Amino acid sequence: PREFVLRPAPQGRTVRCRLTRDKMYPSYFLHLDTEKKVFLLAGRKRKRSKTANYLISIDPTNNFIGKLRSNLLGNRFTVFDNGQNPQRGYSTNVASLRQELAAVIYETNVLGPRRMTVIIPGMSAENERVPIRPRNASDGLLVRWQNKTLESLIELHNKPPVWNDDSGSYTLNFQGRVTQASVKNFQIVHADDPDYIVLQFGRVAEDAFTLDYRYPLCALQAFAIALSSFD
């Protein structure tokens, strides 16, 4: 589990999951969408934070594995593993410092779907993550993004919906994985391949969603990115 939720998905495979929330500060749960519904991750928003802050766990009853934190404004998020914030203790061993696993920037709509940018660490030819572990808040994923120093990173965006002449709607082909309209419905792709669906999220019921991820993402990145879409 601890291993699994941090491993990039296998080449050529789509890992399909079911994300549920309590029917505020609801809990969220992620399971593999197999007939043996194995539990992966859970998260919940902390009430006593100045900004949106979700703790993520590999124990659905409580194992702290990561955190989703928004900026003050609320339109930008960073995903961290379980390591220490360097600003809270400069003498801490570098290996114990938190890494940044993803960032999400949402465009703000006029007072519907929001356009999204997702930035993650780059991968080696070994197909493992090249970790980003800032020694202070003068570096990080959002920082590199705004500076446009994207060498060690991967940039992704939500795929624009297209006209479905059969359903008379602007939508995406979710392959039956998404059955209800929602501002949370999305596909995340790279510019180089609009058909390789890195992350798909969408509603199947009042409190249930599907979340399907592919390489280079792991389950923790996928889950946290999906959580950022709630609000």
Residues that bind ligand I3P (CB under 6 A): 182-184, 203
Return the number of the residue (150 or 183) whose C-beta is nearest ligand I3P: 183
Structure tokens at 9: 């998905």
Minimum Å gap between C-beta 196 and ligand I3P is: 25
Buried (b) or exposed (e) across 143-156, using 16+ Cβ within 10 A?
A: bbbeeeeeeebbeb
Return the number of the residue (157 or 184) whose C-beta is nearest ligand I3P: 184
Minimum Å gap between C-beta 203 and ligand I3P is: 6
Distance CA 222, CA 214 (A): 9
Instruction: Spell out the residues 6+ positions from residue 101 whose beta carbon is closer than 8 angstroms to its own.
Output: 66, 79, 80, 81, 120, 121, 129, 220, 221, 224
CB 224 within 8 A of CB 56: yes
Query: Using CB atoms, what's the residue nearest to ligand I3P?
Result: 182
Return the number of the residue (22 or 155) whose C-beta is nearest ligand I3P: 22
Minimum Å gap between C-beta 98 and ligand I3P is: 29
* Beta-strand relationship, 39-45 and 27-32: antiparallel
Minimum Å gap between C-beta 5 and ligand I3P is: 24
Return the number of the residue (97 or 188) whose C-beta is nearest ligand I3P: 188
Cα three-residue angle 53-54-60, rounded to 5 degrees:
160
Minimum Å gap between C-beta 151 and ligand I3P is: 36
Return the number of the residue (119 or 227) whose C-beta is nearest ligand I3P: 227
Count the alpha carbons within 13 Å of 33 in the hemisphere toward its beta carbon: 16
Minimum Å gap between C-beta 174 and ligand I3P is: 14
Q: If you write DSSP's letter for every residue of 7-39 in order, what string do you get?
A: SPPPTT-EEEEEEEE-----EEEEEESSSS--E
Return the number of the residue (63 or 180) whose C-beta is nearest ligand I3P: 180
